[model samples]
Target: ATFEIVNRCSYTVWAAASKGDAALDAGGRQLNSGESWTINVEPGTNGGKIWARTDCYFDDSGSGICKTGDCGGLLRCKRFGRPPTTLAEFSLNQYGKDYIDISNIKGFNVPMDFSPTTRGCRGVRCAADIVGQCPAKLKAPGGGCNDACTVFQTSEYCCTTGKCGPTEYSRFFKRLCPDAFSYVLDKPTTVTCPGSSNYRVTFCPTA
Candidate 1:
């Protein structure tokens, strides 16, 4: 399917996606506000994440970092970005259907929407104001919020111990972005979207 990366924010968005085996359209250098780029993701392009980068500075070498959603200071990445990023994650056709969701388990740096543009599919999104309303302890360096797991690094927050549920911190995300995955163990965040001809990811969706 084709994934359309759309930037609806007032600033530039350097969008990044999970790497493909053959290196499909990953991240364009910069997507100005109201711009859009498309990428082809065959079934082989499975089990990775997509996100938007902000406040970035790079030389010709593309070796600088972004204030939010920096992926090893590279324009294109093979792995997930650093925490404090909004994420649109997909696992392709693993259980006879594609699994997809918007996640703030690492906390949010931007608002996002992930929706199948075809029939027979559902849309999931996390379009919220986390930066402005973020709790002081959970705030990130420059902007946005960081997950309690990233802050506390304890089993109770990270769910590394495999015995966990929602916390006061997770509820903060869940409350503002009810459609997003707010914690490591957050359920009902994922949805199956098969028969997709194309999907769209919009940053900073309208209120």
Candidate 2:
């Protein structure tokens, strides 16, 4: 029987196996993200047990949880049962991308079932159950979502829309002026701060 190992994590992983008490090793190949490897095995050839393992550093440590890097013990032939013929699909949701919806899937195992459980790896090392969460760090400035004014005050900005007065400007500054200010000129015009850089006009009187 042939089995394929799929990698769903953001990082690469090493796959290895041992037959009949031999030490397991990667054999000089690491599976990169979104990659897979297929190996052939004879169920009853070696004591009816083929021990396969994978090495992954979910904790960012150099060493893996298991001696051979296979945690929760090796995948036993008895547990897997006859090696399902269907291919396993592992999907990845980028940092700010939407998750791959599996709710519509009728057949086959869902990707989330094997995904990692923790927010930033280390809790559970299952690729199918892993879901992406919005990062706590604020997004970069610019655009309405992370506009300059909100970024100046909160050091972060959220994407929203409505309408703004004439004084409102795009969050990004196309040019830099050390002593720049903005205002509307009209009769009885009022000015707020002088000798200051960067000003915006909100209200102006008619002539």
Candidate 3:
């Protein structure tokens, strides 16, 4: 899959990609406002994700921390990002179809749009003012909105137990972005697009 990552935010966003424990070739890059980066993902890749990191500073060897979406404090991430990140997850060419979704299950920092650029497939956007409207308990210390599971870590919120349903905090995120994966069992949020379709992930997208 050809993935184009665009940063439309007013501030810089260090984009990161993670596939299992292996980072892609363009695993991470600094994107200033209005800047963009492109990455090519191989087919049949599972557990792939792309997201943005805010308020980051990387040294010469790409060692640093971000206010949100920090991956083991490395610029080139070898693992999934930490909490308070808006995630664009992908399962490419799965049974000849592509599965994609915008997930706030980890939480949300920047507004995001994850969309396919071919086959007229549908797109999903979580462009709500989630951080601004975040509840006090779910707000992260630095920035962004923390998910219920990340905040409380209870079975109800984290769905560690069987047959868990929505909670107040999950509802808060669901109300804001209906198309986003707000909780562990929110299956309806995932969408299927054409296999091998190109995708665009836009941060702080326009109205």
Candidate 4:
């Protein structure tokens, strides 16, 4: 399977991807507005994820920082990006099925849409303008809204323990981006894609 990343935002953005402990697309490339980058997934790719980064600067050595979604201040991301990002997570060929979901549980930096072009595959999205209305307390240092767990870091909000349920903060995110995972306890946050499909992951899809 392949994942095609599209940047429809007005400015340049960097897209990152990873599978398990390896940096599948480490040193992500910059996508100009309306540009696209695609990555072919290895058959055994597991614990997969894709995310967007913004306000970044890197030289030939590929060392710099992204205002949002910085992965250890490097171009090639060996691990997951920092919080305050929109995440498209997947588990290919897991138990005879393909799993996919969009998550705002880590917070929102860019609006995104994850859809499969293959037949009978369901589409998922979380493209909402969260920067404009981010709560005063959870504002990112550079820009965007931080997730409740990132902002509060409490068991109740992060759902680190107990029978977790939705809180006001999670509800706030759900009200705007209902399809994205709002918290650790969010119900029905994941979906199956039916089979191996070419998924289009777009940043600023509604831009």
Candidates' C-alpha lDDT: 0.82, 0.24, 0.91, 0.84
The deviation in Å at residue 130 for candidate 3 is: 0.2
Candidate 1 residues 1-207, lDDT tens each?
Answer: 789989999999788886533234655457899999888777745766788888888778767888888878877765567788898888776656777889998789989999988867789878778888899999998677999998999999999888899999999999999999999888778878774446899998885
| Most accurate candidate by TM-score | 3
CA deviation > 4 Å runs, candidate 4: none
Candidate 2 runs further than 4 Å off: 23-28, 45-207
Q: In candidate 2, what are the lDDT values of residues 55-173, reduced to their tens digit?
A: 33434333333223242333321222111001111112223221211110111111212122223321111122111211112122110012223334322211223222222222111
- Model 4 residue 73 lDDT score: 79
Candidate 3 lDDT, 4-63, residue by residue in tens: 999999999999998959897568999999998989999998889999999999999999
The model with the greatest lDDT is 3
Write out the backbone clash pairs for model 1.
none
Q: How many residue pairs clash (N, CA or C atoms closer than 3 angstroms) in each of the candidate models, in the order given?
A: 0, 17, 0, 3
Candidate 1 accuracy as lDDT: 0.82
